[PDB]
Ligand binder design. Sequence first.
Ligand SMILES: CC(C)NP(=O)(O)NC(C)C
Ligand SMILES: CC(C)NP(=O)(O)NC(C)C
Ligand SMILES: CC(C)NP(=O)(O)NC(C)C
Ligand SMILES: [Mn+2]
Ligand SMILES: [Mn+2]
Ligand SMILES: [Mn+2]
Ligand SMILES: [Mn+2]
Ligand SMILES: [Mn+2]
Ligand SMILES: [Mn+2]
Ligand SMILES: [Mn+2]
Ligand SMILES: [Mn+2]
Ligand SMILES: [Mn+2]
Ligand SMILES: [Mn+2]
Ligand SMILES: [Mn+2]
Lengths: 425, 417, 417
Amino acid sequence: MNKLAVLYAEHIATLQKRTREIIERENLDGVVFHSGQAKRQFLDDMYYPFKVNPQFKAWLPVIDNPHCWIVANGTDKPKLIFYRPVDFWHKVPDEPNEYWADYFDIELLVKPDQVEKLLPYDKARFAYIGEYLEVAQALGFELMNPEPVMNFYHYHRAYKTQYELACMREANKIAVQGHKAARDAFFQGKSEFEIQQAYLLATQHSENDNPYGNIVALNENCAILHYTHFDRVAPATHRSFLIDAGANFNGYAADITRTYDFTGEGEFAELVATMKQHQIALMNQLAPGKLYGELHLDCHQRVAQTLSDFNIVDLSADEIVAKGITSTFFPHGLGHHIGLQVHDVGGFMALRCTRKIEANQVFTIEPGLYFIDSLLGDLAATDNNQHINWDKVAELKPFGGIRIEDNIIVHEDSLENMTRELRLR
Amino acid sequence: MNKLAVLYAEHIATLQKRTREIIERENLDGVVFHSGQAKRQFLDDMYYPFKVNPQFKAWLPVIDNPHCWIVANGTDKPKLIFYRPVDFWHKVPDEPNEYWADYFDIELLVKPDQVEKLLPYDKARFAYIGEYLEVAQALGFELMNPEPVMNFYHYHRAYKTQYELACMREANKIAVQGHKAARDAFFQGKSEFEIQQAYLLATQHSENDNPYGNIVALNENCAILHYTHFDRVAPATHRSFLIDAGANFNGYAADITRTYDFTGEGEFAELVATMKQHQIALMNQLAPGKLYGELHLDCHQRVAQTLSDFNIVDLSADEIVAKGITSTFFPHGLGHHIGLQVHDVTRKIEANQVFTIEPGLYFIDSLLGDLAATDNNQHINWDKVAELKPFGGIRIEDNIIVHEDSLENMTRELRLR
Amino acid sequence: MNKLAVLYAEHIATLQKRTREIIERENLDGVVFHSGQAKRQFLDDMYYPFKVNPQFKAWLPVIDNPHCWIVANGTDKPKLIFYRPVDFWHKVPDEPNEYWADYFDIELLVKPDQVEKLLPYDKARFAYIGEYLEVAQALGFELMNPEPVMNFYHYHRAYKTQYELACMREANKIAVQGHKAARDAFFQGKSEFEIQQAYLLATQHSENDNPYGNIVALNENCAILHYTHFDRVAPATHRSFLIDAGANFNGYAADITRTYDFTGEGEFAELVATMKQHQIALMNQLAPGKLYGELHLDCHQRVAQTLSDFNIVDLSADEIVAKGITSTFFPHGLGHHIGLQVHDVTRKIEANQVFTIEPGLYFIDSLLGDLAATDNNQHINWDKVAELKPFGGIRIEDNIIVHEDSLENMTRELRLR
Ligand SMILES: CC(C)NP(=O)(O)NC(C)C
Ligand SMILES: CC(C)NP(=O)(O)NC(C)C
Ligand SMILES: CC(C)NP(=O)(O)NC(C)C
Ligand SMILES: [Mn+2]
Ligand SMILES: [Mn+2]
Ligand SMILES: [Mn+2]
Ligand SMILES: [Mn+2]
Ligand SMILES: [Mn+2]
Ligand SMILES: [Mn+2]
Ligand SMILES: [Mn+2]
Ligand SMILES: [Mn+2]
Ligand SMILES: [Mn+2]
Ligand SMILES: [Mn+2]
Ligand SMILES: [Mn+2]
């Protein structure tokens, strides 16, 4: 059989159920999900890569097809207007024939402007869920992405079905295959660009195939949080390596990060090691009922406990915390839900210190320690400048920073660290 | 077909399951729910209006019928003993033939005394849930409203089934109709008595149909938190109007309050608009996991803020809260659960619970006098107090359903400004 | 009709469900539970008393039978290999014809070795849960107590099913009978040994039947937390008495502790009454969501308050908790989970869980001596310890079921004070 296919059946049933609750709560005849269209480059004839509407790939693993429409009410079989053009120019895939095809009443669409006769006769009562408000309005839809319907699905999107969890496991598997190849490459001393190419080859992913734009940084670039470029020339000296990169599976994202030392023995190599442990401990705290805010205060606690131990700051943890200086070394959140979207949706009425970690939710735990001169500077401009070992900073500054991020499934009974279980030390 | 009908199924199921968990926990063979009886007036042949046992209508929408009995163990089908006299004096109704009828095994009772026959022969382990202790004892029951069972059912009453929420929506619907007609009557310059008549006609409710005695206050009566009368004569001039009033549907209540300024302008009209903002802002703080306490505090802050911004108290918000002055302008709670009973049976907000959000701001003598004797007296703009005094007070209250994902303000979704 | 009979259905259903949910997650075709075997005494022909596999009885109440196996997946009716040998030397029980029988496909085993014939043909994706590894491997199994499967059931074992709650109620009932008989034996000045025999006779339990090894202590013995021996000879003088004993029902256990003062007046008697308070006060801070750690810290608080009130210590409750001396008069936990195992398999108290709130205050030389070698020696009222030491200590343990709507102290609801 197909473990995935057996899971899918329940996935559909879950979405169907949520579709019924919501159109009732808002008195709708049904919800229409538009996959989107391709965007044309200004004054050109080229297009940007296509990126499906999350709300559409939520139902099925069709992420590379524009002009597809889902119309459902939760009780009847959902309709799938599937775009399958015909023209010798582009290769034509066979009609939908995989396990999910059976769960929809599929109607083939050959021309994007022919969709109206395939849609409901009276559209006034169906909610349009998509980006092209103009096109919907032309077809007769009047309810444009109703906040109530959007927040509803978004709220439940935080609770991953079994098919979703399996999908995400697959995405993690592919992503580590590449996080290791990218590792080897760093140690072989290749450039950021070469390593990035290594990661793509190992994940069999094209650049536009991955969930977000990879961060492949070396030495001081590791401090650029949102580093996007890829130097083509390998640094003179290879010191530090930080790579934030994921992979995709049926529309679900993986979001892993790893920092490395080139040798594996100096101060920095030591710093990373602390972080790893800190990271794993923060990972170990996830449990239904916990408030993210607690793991937050604890991450910052551990940061300060690290800044004090490596004499980066000549104070104690409680004071680095208290005086409020841990944020200039760890300037971002500890984690975020993740699924169909890297920084996934959810939460009571459209990550907070108040939100509660619940079962079947997926998270990233990504604590970090960075030496970001811009942020480092503003610290020297306050009467805290005194309490810091600047000589120590410049001693590490050339390594940029550290980040370790895993993707963890939270079960009612336990934690499943997809990343580490796949053995990515 | 019938939306209420479908949801009812799950209602019964829920109640049946709630019942099982409890007769097992307390080792009972079943629970008996007595609709109640009609109270005769002293020395007279007249009676009081009938008021069904809450514990009884929790199961079905039969609220105008005395001498009715429900006996269930949560496992077997629930047993309904249905009072139904026969005679020419009173109009007799067609047998129970509505959606709910099928979920019970109905036994027609033609006379109150002719009931013991239909009840369980060995009422040893059956608990009697009702007001009529003696009547029960003489029948054979011994367990009288056994506390653990009452607190049990009452705990779970805070968690409404879908059926219940649908009933509540319908009651808010009716109640808003009335609230609109009431507002109209006010502006037409009618009297409290007349505004009240208007309300009853729009809601198609008789006075004894209200889930509670309406409050129809005009001008300074708006400061009487429990104003009971309806003046037959109208005010010389019309300034303010406060109406707290709801309605009923299948035993569920709506509890809605709205305040209005007659001219729509002046300081009071703006104070009501300020209040309306706070009310909505409070309603918007509701969310599963949260402590009502939190909302209570913020409400007092909102009052503190308003008191300062309008120059009622010459102190900053924090100054007004710190000195506990707010409580003399807003003496009651912020809200309560609502359901089968208007005031339904630290505490954390949770899904499927229905609350009222009723911030208020009033100018009450008793309390302003008590304030004048606390020395805070030399901190409040007694001129501004006297200026607004003639308006009485303000209160705005909605009924909100709290879903796991969002809020459903029944009252405002009905477009009752 | 019957009692447990009904609740059992839902018991099976639930374990079935939990099994489905786990075989799939671990990619297993099924799980096999081994009741166990009777261990033979070295070089002899006598055996140890049989002690069933918790994981095995977790399904049905067959705790005295070795060579029994359960094979399930969560979807198919569960498979039961019931060991039932035949021969004139032993009495032969009828075939399993009790309510729990029908929930299984029952295959009788007459000799152990003959088990391979009834077990899964391909044992590749079957997890063996038992302690007899070599026998498993020799049978074909390879998956021996896979950790993620063990941690699964155990996690859920913390949530009892109605049936399981019934069974535990019965256990508490029986235990309380024995706890009252034991109580009287104490006042009648009997020896530890006699008191125990009194407990056993009242609870109708043979020594090996009780959940754990009963602790029956008198005087200074009370300070020995794990007192295992029973004095055959009564104490010269009768001061104090601590008894930690429980019972067994269908595999479920009771674990109650009561401390007494012979005279019923005097420092100790007082100190005991107070402890009783703190125990009831704590038993009341039990509620879904409560953080054990908060209870545990509040207990140590009351302990420090008693150490200060009875002036055992010369410091304020807080300074006592401050210098952490409290850990020398209360060296053990505040409670634990209980169910199929006495010590059942930062944490929050959920509903449908069962806890043993068991606070205590003891005069252990072993620790007082350690404490006297610290600057705290400076604060301790030694002249007071010598006045209590002769009584050993105290411990009041109850078994409470946490429901979502309320709390249920089984022990106390049974009348044991
Ligand atoms: C770019 C983004 C996907 N990486 P991240 O959100 O996991 N961590 C940030 C803070 C760099
Ligand atoms: C009379 C009662 C139903 N109104 P209320 O409880 O909503 N507000 C009170 C505080 C005046
Ligand atoms: C022997 C054991 C079952 N008793 P307990 O664990 O409840 N208390 C300890 C401190 C003796
Ligand atoms: Mn079709
Ligand atoms: Mn950016
Ligand atoms: Mn990342
Ligand atoms: Mn991330
Ligand atoms: Mn009870
Ligand atoms: Mn009153
Ligand atoms: Mn009201
Ligand atoms: Mn109210
Ligand atoms: Mn021991
Ligand atoms: Mn014990
Ligand atoms: Mn114990």
